[PDB]
Amino acid sequence: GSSKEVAELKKQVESAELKNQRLKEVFQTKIQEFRKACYTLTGYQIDITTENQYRLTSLYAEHPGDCLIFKATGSKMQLLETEFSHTVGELIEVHLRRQDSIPAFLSSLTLELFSRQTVA
Amino acid sequence: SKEVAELKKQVESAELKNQRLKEVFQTKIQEFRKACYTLTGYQIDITTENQYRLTSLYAEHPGDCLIFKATSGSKMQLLETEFSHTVGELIEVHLRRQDSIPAFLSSLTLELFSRQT
């Protein structure tokens, strides 16, 4: 049959599902806006990995795929090793380990990469 | 009659999900902002008229902040605050001469860190 009630319920379902999709979109948009502002201003694109780590990529990265990974231990972060991080052992020692400051470390790294970016 | 029951169930399930998603999206957005702060040393507030207020982890005085404005946005301009008026040299070196906000904010983070260090 062609129940009017059934047809209207289908429309209620469609509307409810669309509403949830809109909610997801607003969330994604908010995160992306924040990410874009952080990337533009600080020079780091901050992504969330499949394993709930944070993947940082520099605006001035030398090569495709160069990144740092940090994992929360949320107020505290620990660096995980990457191809790229093994190449910046000294910045890590000086700033991340010895000064005990992630911001000093990332700040120093941004300045070093920026310097490398303009070599010619 | 079965179908009526099923669709009703689907409506209720989607509404429940709506309420629960609102909750977890809200907390996640806050967690992301806080992570950016913990890592970069800047707390970013998104404000009206396409502006971003940034506060350093190493700010010396409550209220010290920087305000940036997007021309749309991609291109950012530093607006003036009482605090920006105290870092003229950093502005000159990294914004005027290098045109790099990331170099500016990175250098500022190291300067403020040195002031407590």
XYZ file of all heavy atoms in Angstrom, chain B residues 5-39:
294
model
N 6.499 1.117 13.021
C 7.310 0.924 14.217
C 8.804 1.128 13.931
O 9.518 1.792 14.693
C 7.075 -0.464 14.782
N 9.264 0.585 12.815
C 10.669 0.694 12.449
C 11.106 2.129 12.185
O 12.138 2.551 12.680
C 10.984 -0.174 11.244
C 12.455 -0.129 10.842
C 12.735 -0.948 9.590
O 12.144 -2.049 9.443
O 13.536 -0.480 8.749
N 10.310 2.887 11.431
C 10.679 4.251 11.074
C 10.653 5.122 12.323
O 11.497 6.000 12.493
C 9.728 4.819 10.007
C 9.814 4.232 8.597
C 8.592 4.604 7.764
C 11.080 4.680 7.881
N 9.672 4.894 13.197
C 9.617 5.629 14.460
C 10.885 5.408 15.258
O 11.466 6.339 15.849
C 8.410 5.192 15.297
C 7.075 5.736 14.798
C 5.924 5.192 15.646
C 4.576 5.764 15.237
N 3.445 5.080 15.957
N 11.328 4.164 15.267
C 12.551 3.808 15.953
C 13.743 4.573 15.360
O 14.584 5.086 16.102
C 12.755 2.304 15.845
C 13.968 1.811 16.538
C 14.004 0.300 16.484
C 15.188 -0.226 17.239
N 16.476 0.241 16.639
N 13.791 4.668 14.029
C 14.851 5.388 13.341
C 14.874 6.886 13.662
O 15.945 7.492 13.760
C 14.720 5.198 11.834
C 15.003 3.790 11.356
C 14.833 3.649 9.843
O 14.951 4.626 9.111
N 14.568 2.430 9.374
N 13.692 7.480 13.784
C 13.583 8.876 14.164
C 14.141 9.068 15.566
O 14.948 9.976 15.808
C 12.115 9.389 14.081
C 11.994 10.768 14.738
C 11.650 9.433 12.614
N 13.740 8.212 16.496
C 14.184 8.365 17.880
C 15.687 8.174 17.997
O 16.381 8.893 18.741
C 13.459 7.370 18.784
C 12.009 7.728 19.000
C 11.275 6.726 19.881
O 11.527 5.501 19.758
O 10.443 7.174 20.701
N 16.208 7.196 17.266
C 17.641 6.929 17.313
C 18.458 8.124 16.783
O 19.480 8.536 17.375
C 17.958 5.625 16.559
O 19.342 5.531 16.260
N 18.016 8.714 15.679
C 18.710 9.890 15.145
C 18.673 11.091 16.085
O 19.644 11.848 16.172
C 18.173 10.283 13.759
N 17.568 11.280 16.799
C 17.489 12.386 17.758
C 18.382 12.174 18.948
O 18.993 13.127 19.454
C 16.065 12.620 18.253
C 15.953 13.786 19.240
C 16.455 15.116 18.660
O 16.217 15.363 17.454
O 17.090 15.906 19.403
N 18.463 10.927 19.405
C 19.346 10.594 20.518
C 20.777 10.860 20.080
O 21.566 11.517 20.777
C 19.155 9.129 20.923
C 19.701 8.744 22.304
C 18.852 7.617 22.886
C 21.157 8.329 22.254
N 21.120 10.383 18.895
C 22.451 10.582 18.396
C 22.790 12.087 18.294
O 23.921 12.510 18.599
C 22.555 9.863 17.048
C 23.858 9.989 16.354
C 24.033 8.879 15.314
C 25.455 8.899 14.786
N 25.743 7.761 13.889
N 21.814 12.893 17.884
C 22.002 14.337 17.773
C 22.456 14.935 19.096
O 23.427 15.689 19.169
C 20.707 15.032 17.315
C 20.928 16.520 17.024
O 20.666 17.366 17.876
N 21.432 16.836 15.827
N 21.771 14.548 20.166
C 22.074 15.074 21.482
C 23.481 14.657 21.945
O 24.246 15.454 22.499
C 20.994 14.592 22.459
C 19.595 15.172 22.152
C 18.423 14.335 22.660
O 18.589 13.206 23.133
N 17.219 14.889 22.548
N 23.831 13.398 21.695
C 25.129 12.870 22.108
C 26.270 13.439 21.241
O 27.351 13.704 21.756
C 25.156 11.327 22.035
C 24.092 10.589 22.848
C 24.312 10.697 24.297
N 23.887 11.980 24.834
C 22.623 12.294 25.089
N 21.644 11.428 24.815
N 22.335 13.484 25.601
N 26.073 13.595 19.944
C 27.087 14.239 19.099
C 27.385 15.686 19.485
O 28.567 16.093 19.512
C 26.732 14.159 17.603
C 26.728 12.757 16.999
C 26.410 12.828 15.514
C 28.029 12.000 17.222
N 26.352 16.466 19.801
C 26.563 17.840 20.246
C 27.564 17.884 21.386
O 28.490 18.718 21.408
C 25.255 18.472 20.717
C 24.314 18.862 19.606
C 23.075 19.528 20.162
C 22.177 20.002 19.062
N 20.915 20.589 19.593
N 27.357 16.995 22.341
C 28.211 16.890 23.521
C 29.654 16.612 23.147
O 30.549 17.308 23.636
C 27.710 15.801 24.476
C 26.350 16.097 25.064
C 25.641 14.912 25.703
O 26.011 13.737 25.479
O 24.665 15.177 26.423
N 29.899 15.578 22.338
C 31.275 15.179 22.132
C 31.969 16.139 21.161
O 33.176 16.291 21.234
C 31.500 13.694 21.722
C 30.899 12.713 22.787
C 30.975 13.417 20.350
N 31.228 16.791 20.272
C 31.868 17.738 19.347
C 32.320 18.970 20.102
O 33.375 19.544 19.828
C 30.900 18.148 18.233
C 30.657 17.061 17.196
C 29.473 17.038 16.472
C 31.609 16.072 16.946
C 29.240 16.067 15.544
C 31.371 15.092 16.017
C 30.182 15.101 15.295
N 31.508 19.379 21.062
C 31.800 20.570 21.841
C 33.099 20.380 22.619
O 33.987 21.248 22.563
C 30.632 20.884 22.789
C 30.873 22.071 23.694
C 29.694 22.343 24.617
O 28.588 22.612 24.155
N 29.926 22.261 25.928
N 33.222 19.261 23.342
C 34.418 18.976 24.111
C 35.617 18.764 23.214
O 36.741 19.147 23.576
C 34.276 17.741 25.031
O 34.121 16.559 24.228
C 33.086 17.936 25.982
N 35.411 18.172 22.043
C 36.550 17.905 21.151
C 37.151 19.200 20.619
O 38.372 19.311 20.489
C 36.173 17.006 19.983
C 37.368 16.593 19.113
C 38.276 15.652 19.937
C 39.355 14.987 19.110
N 40.021 13.897 19.901
N 36.299 20.172 20.304
C 36.766 21.460 19.791
C 37.645 22.119 20.862
O 38.733 22.636 20.574
C 35.595 22.365 19.439
C 34.925 21.835 18.148
C 36.066 23.830 19.265
C 33.586 22.459 17.786
N 37.191 22.061 22.106
C 37.980 22.617 23.214
C 39.295 21.868 23.368
O 40.358 22.484 23.585
C 37.166 22.591 24.509
C 36.018 23.626 24.503
C 36.438 25.030 23.992
O 35.874 25.546 23.012
N 37.417 25.649 24.660
N 39.255 20.544 23.245
C 40.484 19.752 23.367
C 41.500 20.119 22.270
O 42.721 20.190 22.522
C 40.144 18.253 23.378
C 41.319 17.300 23.215
C 40.862 15.886 22.870
O 39.991 15.333 23.583
O 41.365 15.343 21.869
N 41.011 20.353 21.054
C 41.869 20.738 19.941
C 42.525 22.100 20.154
O 43.754 22.240 19.954
C 41.098 20.759 18.637
C 41.971 20.986 17.436
C 42.981 20.085 17.139
C 41.808 22.084 16.631
C 43.798 20.270 16.053
C 42.631 22.276 15.533
C 43.633 21.371 15.249
N 41.734 23.103 20.534
C 42.273 24.423 20.892
C 43.349 24.286 21.976
O 44.390 24.940 21.917
C 41.159 25.362 21.392
C 41.607 26.683 22.118
C 40.389 27.578 22.448
N 40.692 28.849 23.126
C 40.685 29.035 24.450
N 40.424 28.023 25.273
N 40.952 30.240 24.968
N 43.084 23.463 22.989
C 44.015 23.324 24.109
C 45.281 22.625 23.622
O 46.393 22.995 24.000
C 43.369 22.536 25.247
C 44.225 22.367 26.454
C 43.500 21.630 27.567
C 44.429 21.380 28.751
N 43.711 20.710 29.872
N 45.137 21.644 22.740
C 46.326 20.980 22.195
C 47.197 21.944 21.394
O 48.416 21.917 21.508
C 45.931 19.757 21.338
N 46.579 22.803 20.582
C 47.344 23.780 19.828
C 48.145 24.694 20.780
O 49.304 25.054 20.512
C 46.417 24.579 18.927
S 45.698 23.518 17.603
N 47.523 25.040 21.892
C 48.136 25.871 22.918
C 49.323 25.168 23.574
O 50.412 25.764 23.682
C 47.090 26.262 23.970
C 47.505 27.231 25.056
C 48.493 28.187 24.850
C 46.855 27.233 26.269
C 48.828 29.108 25.865
C 47.176 28.135 27.275
C 48.166 29.069 27.066
O 48.470 29.950 28.069
N 49.106 23.932 24.031
C 50.163 23.151 24.680
C 51.395 22.993 23.785
O 52.542 23.088 24.256
C 49.652 21.755 25.084
O 48.557 21.923 25.979
C 50.747 20.964 25.784
N 51.158 22.742 22.508
C 52.235 22.540 21.536
C 52.925 23.848 21.097
O 54.143 23.981 21.249
C 51.660 21.812 20.333
C 51.146 20.397 20.633
C 50.335 19.842 19.464
C 52.304 19.473 20.969
